[PDB]
Subunit: 334 residues, 3 copies
């Protein structure tokens, strides 16, 4: 019926992204992906707070899927019998049936296969959306990720010049709502079902207890810091499925930024801080000019420093004293 070549993709866990071409001479293909839902209790902070998570492929965020404009994305969604709830998937990149959600509702023990054509370029959120009050709950429990649909000629600056990245990372930000008991300690639950009543009362007050990248406080730091070298052009894809974020690379800039995340629009240049609308993904690229540590944060600094929303980059290379120099080191006031 639809007679195109098929290509399988092996998804990798964020913040890494599966191998792909930017500009390509391939024509349209059916690109095949598989997502398996996992409900699990996880640790979200350095004090040992636990959380009833619901995930695609066992990670928060779900993995980034990368295709090109005109491809057909065929996803097998699997809800094993070890889960307790029905789940589905909705792609903001897709057209019709509530983004696919109306065609993908599966009980524990079932799977479904959905195909959608990638007619719109950019980065887009996907998330679970089973219906009614379950929709927010599933999403803030971790069931969201993103897809990137590239132009076949790769990215451009709007002003006919190509924009090629040397690497891409995917930072998924997650607002989490963990209730406290009378003592003021965070509560733990035996199942997602049991967490629901207390969690929903807290959610409706709209203030998260934690805001984290890659599912945990400190996930993208120390040994798991993002890396680059001076001279490298890095693309950072940032998603937030429920709540606004304001990304900022401390010590750097957004050289080229698509804050609404859609490549039919020219990027903005030379930003300090950009804005990711809740329910969207955006993308920023920067060429590193200096070595050392950078922090990538949401620039509500309370959220960054106290609620979990800080990642690090470690950058190698030579210090440029023309760009910045300590003229005189700390010394007593004359």
């Amino acid at each position: 019926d639809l007679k195109l070549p098929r290509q399988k993709v092996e998804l990798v866990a964020p913040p890494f992204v599966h191998a792909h071409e930017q500009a390509t001479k391939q024509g349209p293909k059916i690109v095949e992906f598989k997502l398996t839902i996992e409900e699990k209790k996880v640790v979200i902070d350095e004090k040992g707070t636990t959380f009833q998570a619901m995930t695609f492929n066992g990670s928060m965020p779900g993995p980034l899927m990368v295709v090109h404009e005109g491809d057909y994305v065929e996803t097998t969604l699997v809800n094993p019998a070890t889960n307790t709830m029905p789940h589905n998937i909705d792609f903001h990149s897709a057209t019709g049936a509530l983004g696919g959600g109306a065609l993908t509702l599966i009980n524990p023990g079932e799977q479904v296969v959905l195909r959608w054509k990638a007619t719109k370029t950019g980065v887009f959120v996907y998330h679970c959306a089973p219906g009614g009050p379950m929709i927010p709950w599933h999403v803030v429990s971790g069931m969201n990720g993103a897809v990137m649909v590239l132009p076949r000629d790769g990215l451009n600056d709007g002003k006919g010049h190509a924009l090629k990245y040397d690497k891409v990372y995917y930072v998924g930000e997650q607002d989490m709502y963990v209730p406290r008991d009378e003592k003021g300690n965070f509560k733990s639950y035996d199942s997602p079902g049991e967490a629901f009543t207390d969690t929903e009362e807290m959610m409706k007050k709209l203030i998260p207890s934690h805001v984290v990248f890659n599912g945990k406080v400190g996930a993208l730091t120390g040994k798991n810091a993002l890396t680059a070298n001076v001279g490298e052009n890095v693309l950072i894809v940032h998603s937030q499925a429920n709540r606004d974020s304001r990304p900022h690379l401390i010590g750097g800039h957004g050289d080229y930024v698509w804050e609404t995340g859609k490549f039919g629009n020219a990027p903005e240049v030379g930003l300090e801080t950009w804005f990711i609308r809740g329910g969207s993904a955006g993308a920023a690229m920067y060429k590193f000019m200096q070595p050392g540590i950078y922090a990538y944060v949401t620039h509500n600094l309370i959220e960054a420093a106290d609620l979990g929303a800080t990642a690090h980059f470690k950058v190698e290379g030579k210090w440029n004293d023309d760009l910045m120099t300590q003229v005189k080191a700390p010394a007593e006031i004359p």
Copy 2:
């Protein structure tokens, strides 16, 4: 003095918009509108919660006024003796006197006539603004709507091509602050005056109890769903007079979006989610490609699913399997 032709407009209740031309060969006219203030107790949710509303023309939002660049808008504002408070009107589209507010303060029993020239194209908020602490209270009680000022040549994509809509809807989003008693039930009041003290304490904490389109949970659903057909280009005008919103059409896109709402700027293309700044209106147009149900939401999903901010479209036409198809229906895992 000002010797131009006069044209009366009969306003219609949102989400409908009074009949108007897009591109027009008419020159400037004085366009005449009348707004009558109504204070009333209304029901805002399916559990029967009540609210002391203050409205233009008896609706939340007030009706959309549509004119063209260079027109003169002459508004008669009427505050009948059955109301209890002074009221006025401020147009963000207008220049001078706090948008008209400083020239339109009227006690119960009075009316006033204001004229302003429409020098700026786009969609703009209007709202009551009597002075001091009353300003937020009147606005979050429902006294806000919007005006659309069209270019005389109609809308364009910035890239010399015309953008004609087949229909336009106006979705006004309202953040509401209903206090709870010691039990945890929503309180009811006999008058706006009596609601004021409890309402103001809640407002200053910045978290709404409800966020609704067209004045009530479920207002734009079921029999009152928005409608379209595959192939129709629909313009959705969205306003929020006090608090940010992030509109999203589930299963669709914003083909052409003016998120800051001003037609001197080219629209952005192919958005998933857009951002309406508190105190502004924006506009998005989409051509439907698939039939079925779509939800139009703010993509803070807690607000959408739990606080009231969801509308529906029912779209007629033929399903397009090239864009999306269920390859295999729900089935047991092999």
Copy 3:
């Protein structure tokens, strides 16, 4: 080593800005600035509420520094022995070492000299960032300001036409977190250290007690209103180092707006309300067309009217009845 001419600047307190050229025939210079940190208890509202402030040069916000693209900015930061905490400075305009913060940490009694090259045009935040949980606390205590880096040819509209302002004001917005005691009154503290524990618990709940321009409720009103005349083009630079804002000039517009604040991007035109992302500065220019009072607010009106975020302009000149007129004054309903 770096052999360029040196120029000293005398900083002035906001909302004024030190004298500078827009378009300039000067080449790159080393521009020298000095900032002295002051910790002090201040009054932030008309009821006499006090607050433990931490400031650059004794003001909230810190003063605006103005330079041109390609200049080298050399800042002497001074932390006198009368202060109690270590401090530093981070410039969003600068490249490397966490914006300078990693090179400027000074204990009470010390000073440091940092030089950075201004490679990026626009308005940018600077703020203290000592490390960890101290970062948000220092910033919301008042330790933030902004810098403007102008193109050497001055500003343009993107469409080759020059945009010259007759004056510029700097409005720094500050979200403040003052705890309440059991009575419900605001608490006072003897030192910043003692304020810390209660302040941090409140901060993590993300709702400010006050939102103020220029450090106090009513600071930019009455005798300290901003001024202009009909026909004057005024540039308003607005910063928020931690939390989003949505500026709006009541009775006017943003004729040309850089809401992300970066002059490599063309401005948007004819805005009603614009958006300043937390951790950024933006800039709007407007030519006054009418005399009288204007209010400049964040258009969350609860914040504007009840939490402190309102400034005034008093504009002189002749009223234009073509733009707006009271056709009929308040009168009894026929």
